[PDB]
Amino acid sequence: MLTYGAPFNFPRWIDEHAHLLKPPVGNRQVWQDSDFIVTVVGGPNHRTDYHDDPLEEFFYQLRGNAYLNLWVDGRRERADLKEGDIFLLPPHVRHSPQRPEAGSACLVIERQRPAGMLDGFEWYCDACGHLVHRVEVQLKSIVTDLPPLFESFY
Numbered sequence: 001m002l003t004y005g006a007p008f009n010f011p012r013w014i015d016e017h018a019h020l021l022k023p024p025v026g027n028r029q030v031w032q033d034s035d036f037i038v039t040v041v042g043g044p045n046h047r048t049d050y051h052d053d054p055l056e057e058f059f060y061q062l063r064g065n066a067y068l069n070l071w072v073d074g075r076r077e078r079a080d081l082k083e084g085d086i087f088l089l090p091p092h093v094r095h096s097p098q099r100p101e102a103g104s105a106c107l108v109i110e111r112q113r114p115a116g117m118l119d120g121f122e123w124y125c126d127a128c129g130h131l132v133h134r135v136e137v138q139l140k141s142i143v144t145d146l147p148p149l150f151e152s153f154y
């Protein structure tokens with residue numbers, strides 16, 4: 001049979017999950033236990049961490065707008081994700097995804113990292129532009145391997 005089920009209307013499925021696409025949660029993963037981690041991410045949410053992902057991430061901004069703060073060539077650059085945009089982020093490229101809008105929704109796709117492949121999270125000094133903290137973490141379930149990880153800084 002079909003491990004990950006039938007095809008379904010995306011719009012509807014998004015609408016039926018609007019409640020789940022804003023705080024305290026924000027995001028909602030479409031299929032469970034897939035190599036391809038396919039998620040919709042909502043708003044609003046802002047964050048202070050930069051993600052260094054050892055695999056690429058694919059983004060598609062189905063509704064409203066957002067942006068990525070990026071650490072490029074030792075410089076604090078930014079990438080708009082207006083409504084409509086797609087984008088393929090390289091691995092290890094440092095990114096902080098900012099979703100201001102209530103009712104925005106972005107498709108985000110990623111691979112389960114294999115055992116040995118680590119993610120990094122890091123925060124940066126707004127002043128002296130220097131790396132303040134960095135964790136490396138073996139990601140496996142992106143709701144258990146993250147909320148503590150986040151809270152021992154704030």
Ligand SMILES: [Fe+2]
Nearest residue numbers: 051053057095
């Ligand atoms: Fe990320």
